[PDB]
Design a protein. Structure first.
Lengths: 521, 104, 104
């Protein structure tokens, strides 16, 4: 071993190396792990018998265990190093990551009258294991809080681990599964020991960062006509009598709309439209009522965000779909019923070319079957599934957004990729689980059948380090004029963005899209 | 095998989310209905509004029938109200159809 | 430099040091906020530094004696460049570096 208490078990690496295309980014933070559930498993539930409705019913357990969540980008990229990424590159995907705990120190605390006093406990241990067999509910990917804080000076609290399972109402069914985490092989650690493992990401497509410079309908040649014909006019024109006649034409530069096109816009699932200007929106609560939902097992679940769809069409900035966009908070924003000013609104404008506008109809098709006496009637297609000849763009990723998600293991899936953005994976990074080894207080002298109900209040702290080797797709393009680049304001401001403020609260003013550089569709 | 977790329940019961959703379009608790955009986070309390990374499988509706006779309508809807697809002028009943949960 | 000394295009690096922050006991229920409490702490140790210097020997033919920096011959209340009664070290006057002479 050659470690012991007198020696530190690691170093501090927060760095980003740009090596050719590969870019290695590491980080380190200080973590503190409070004791959870007085070392108990607990069935938790919410029944509709209370104020809850049938949609909010759940059943599940809350374990004492807790888990590191690094899943968000802003853990792994300093905004500058996140600038070099999105300005100079088309696409990037992870390759392998490595993970370390070290410098683990355990502490205990006692309450004597109002004196709150801490000391060190040398022998006490913590337990650590990763699930490499994916045998547990994988709860990363739902974008829960508690990820490594962006600004490395911060010290964070490891979030508790719990999971949900089948229910009928508040009760449970026979397939309801239970898991006792102490039932897995785990490693016990002493203030001298450290824990390390290496992961390797499965083959995954480069995440595309770029905006097509050609809207999908404009692929034509402006100058030249086409040799195909279309039906221009059904009625003999320029006469007092309306006698119907079939006339045909070619679609040239003059009429580009009728040209025969080889592809289709991406799929469309409509959303309700909302204006930032208050007066323009209706007076009602349509938030939940007119929301875009999907019905599953009697529980109506709002679609958040939904399929990736252009936020708003040209020359309207203000309108945004109801649920369609990711919405972050400003630093220090309230939890509930907080005003518009505190949230931030991502925007899909980059993909307006290849995907339909979110709040507007996908297309129009014929409702009826025409006749001499029957006028043709055409309906709107609000939701259009995937048809052959459709191309589309997945949702962009943001500095704050999640990096990946675990593809559910099921027989059939269509183009897996999360709705929040990021990468879909069939074998995501394992999730690390960690717990204080419970230390019982003094039991009585006379034997007692019951399990020990007392423990020494305890918590542990240490350092964690994670690196991710990334692969880049170099941007090679002939565009003559300059591109668009993400750049900080030139003009003066109260205080620097992406940097601390007077009282020491780190703050990030606005989300960062990944798509600036352009590519010929 | 049967998945032990319904697709909407993939979340973590305890922890909130950092995303926000639109909770309320109208200023609440006042005599005037002035519209206002308020936002919130979906936590354990409201799990329905949480941002989810996947969707249910595809759906092609069927007509519903009860084994209890009194509950079903009085008619023959068997063929008439059936779920069909039209091909080359020949209407062909869809048997069984896409795999879909029998009853909630 | 204007203060004197040597200009350098790659000076000695500057060493930076900090106590590793140790958080106090966080609450049981998870909290989104970063930890605002810490254990009051300080550290102490020993530091050692050496500098290998190069000299240009003084080789000169001047006949008469030079000027040299020398402590006073005459008595004084207490020794210069040395501690005083209460233990406060003191240096009475600055020391220039130029005494020896050289032909321009």
């Amino acid at each position: 071993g050659a470690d012991g208490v007198g020696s530190s078990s690691g170093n501090w690496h927060c760095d980003s190396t740009w090596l050719g295309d590969r870019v290695i980014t590491t980080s380190t933070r200080t973590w503190a792990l409070p004791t959870y559930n007085n070392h108990l498993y607990k069935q938790i539930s919410n029944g509709t018998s209370g104020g809850s409705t049938n949609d909010n019913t759940y059943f599940g357990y809350s374990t004492p265990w807790g888990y590191f969540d690094f899943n968000r980008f802003h853990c792994h990229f300093s905004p500058r190093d996140w600038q070099r990424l999105i300005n100079n590159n088309w696409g990037f995907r992870p390759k392998r990551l490595n993970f370390k705990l070290f410098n683990i120190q355990v502490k205990e605390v006692t309450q004597n009258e109002g004196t709150k006093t801490i000391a060190n406990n040398l022998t006490s241990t913590i337990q650590v294991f990763t699930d490499s067999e994916y045998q547990l509910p994988y709860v990363l990917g739902s974008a829960h809080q508690g990820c490594l804080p962006p600004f490395p000076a911060d010290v964070f609290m490891i979030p508790q681990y719990g999971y949900l399972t089948l229910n009928n109402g508040s009760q449970a069914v026979g397939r309801s599964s239970f898991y006792c985490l102490e039932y897995f092989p785990s490693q016990m650690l002493r203030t001298g020991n450290n824990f390390e493992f290496s992961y390797q990401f499965e083959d995954v497509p480069f995440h595309s960062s770029y905006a097509h410079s050609q809207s999908l309908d404009r692929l034509m040649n402006p100058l030249i006509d086409q040799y195909l014909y279309y039906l221009s006019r059904t009625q003999s024109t320029g006469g007092t009598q309306g006698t119907q006649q079939l006339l045909f034409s070619q679609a040239g530069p003059a009429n580009m709309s009728a040209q025969a096109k080889n592809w289709l816009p991406g799929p469309c699932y409509r959303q309700q439209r909302v204006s930032t200007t208050l007066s323009q929106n209706n007076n009602s609560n349509f938030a939940w009522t007119g929301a875009t939902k999907y019905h599953l097992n009697g529980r109506d679940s709002l679609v958040n965000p939904g399929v990736a769809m252009a936020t708003h069409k040209d020359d309207e900035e203000r309108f945004f779909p109801s649920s369609g966009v990711l919405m972050f908070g400003k630093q220090g924003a309230g939890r509930d019923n907080v005003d518009y000013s505190s949230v931030m609104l991502t925007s899909e404008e980059e993909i307006k070319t290849t995907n339909p506008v979110a709040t507007e109809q996908y297309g129009v098709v014929a409702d009826n079957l025409q006749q001499t006496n029957t006028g043709p009637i055409v309906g709107n297609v609000n939701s259009q599934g995937a048809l052959p000849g459709m191309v589309w763009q997945n949702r962009d990723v943001y500095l704050q957004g999640p990096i990946w998600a675990k593809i559910p293991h099921t027989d059939g899936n269509f183009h897996p990729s999360p709705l929040m953005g990021g990468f879909g994976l069939k074998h995501p990074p394992p999730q690390i689980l960690i717990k204080n080894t419970p230390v019982p207080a003094d039991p009585p002298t006379t034997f007692s059948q019951a399990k020990l109900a007392s423990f020494i209040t305890q918590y542990s702290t240490g350092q964690v380090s994670v690196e991710i080797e990334w692969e880049l797709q170099k941007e090679n393009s002939k565009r003559w004029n300059p591109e668009i680049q993400y750049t900080s304001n030139y003009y003066k401001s109260t205080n620097v963005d992406f940097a601390v403020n007077t009282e020491g609260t780190y703050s990030e003013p606005r989300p960062i899209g990944t798509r600036y550089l352009t590519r010929n569709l």
